[PDB]
Amino acid sequence: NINAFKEAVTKIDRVEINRRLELAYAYNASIAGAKTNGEYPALVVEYARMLEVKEQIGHVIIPRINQDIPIYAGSAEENLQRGVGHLEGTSLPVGGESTHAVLTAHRGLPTAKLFTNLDKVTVGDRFYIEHIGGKIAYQVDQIKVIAPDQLEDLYVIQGEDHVTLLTATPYMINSHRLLVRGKRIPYVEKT
């Protein structure tokens, strides 16, 4: 899992990593640029191929709830079973001006806690993402509960850099979605 990712990435030269991020940066700019054109966001395929190392696109760490979990491309059930699903149609989770990454998961599973305690994360709490290019930090600036049908909160916000953690709610009813939103912040690597 994560281990096979950290070690795998460490074996890839700078130039290749660079090339792969640049693909993802361009992909994120396309998504943000369609949004500015008043275009609608559409929320076996390799849209995030460039970011995959051992089938994963990164992992999400959340110290408040002791979770460190691998991110898979796409919101497909078989992925949602082993970790986080990245929502196709939303920014790839490498940061940048005008990016909004969205990651989903099951809020409770006999095999993995996953986002079962996401309701404990509070504004001001931090979460991190490790990807091929390294590690970036977010601080929670918004917590919201929407209907499954309400999509506006998941679109790119021009000028901003965000990632939304999403899961079903209330616990055991799962009739609405809970969104825990982070704002990009600086991250002091040697710490």
DSSP string, the chain: -HHHHHHHHTTS-HHHHHHHHHHHHHHHHHHHHHHHTTPPP-----TTGGG-BTTB-EEEEEGGGTEEEEEEES--HHHHTTSEEE-TTS--SS--TTEEEEEE--S-BTTB-GGGSGGG--TT-EEEEEETTEEEEEEEEEEEEE-TT--GGGS--TT-EEEEEEEEESTTT--EEEEEEEEEE---TT-
Beta bridge pairs of residue 166: 179
Neighbouring residues of 4: CB distance < 8 A, sequence distance ≥ 6? 53, 54, 56
* Cα Rg of the chain, angstroms: 16
Domain housing 171: 1-191
Structure tokens at 31: 């998504």
Resolution given for this structure, in angstroms:
2.3
| Amino acid at site 154 | L
Task: List the CATH number of the domain containing 170.
Answer: 2.40.260.10
Classify residue 21 as left (phi > 0), alpha (psi -120 to 50) or beta: alpha
What's the distance, CA 165 to chain centroid? 7
Per the CB < 8 A criterion, the answer to whether 168 and 107 are in contact is yes
Distance (Å, rounded) from C-alpha 120 to C-alpha 39? Answer: 35
**For the chain, first and last CA: distance in Å?**
24
Expt. technique: X-ray
Structure tokens at 156: 């790119």
Q: How many CB atoms lie within 10 A of CB 38?
A: 6
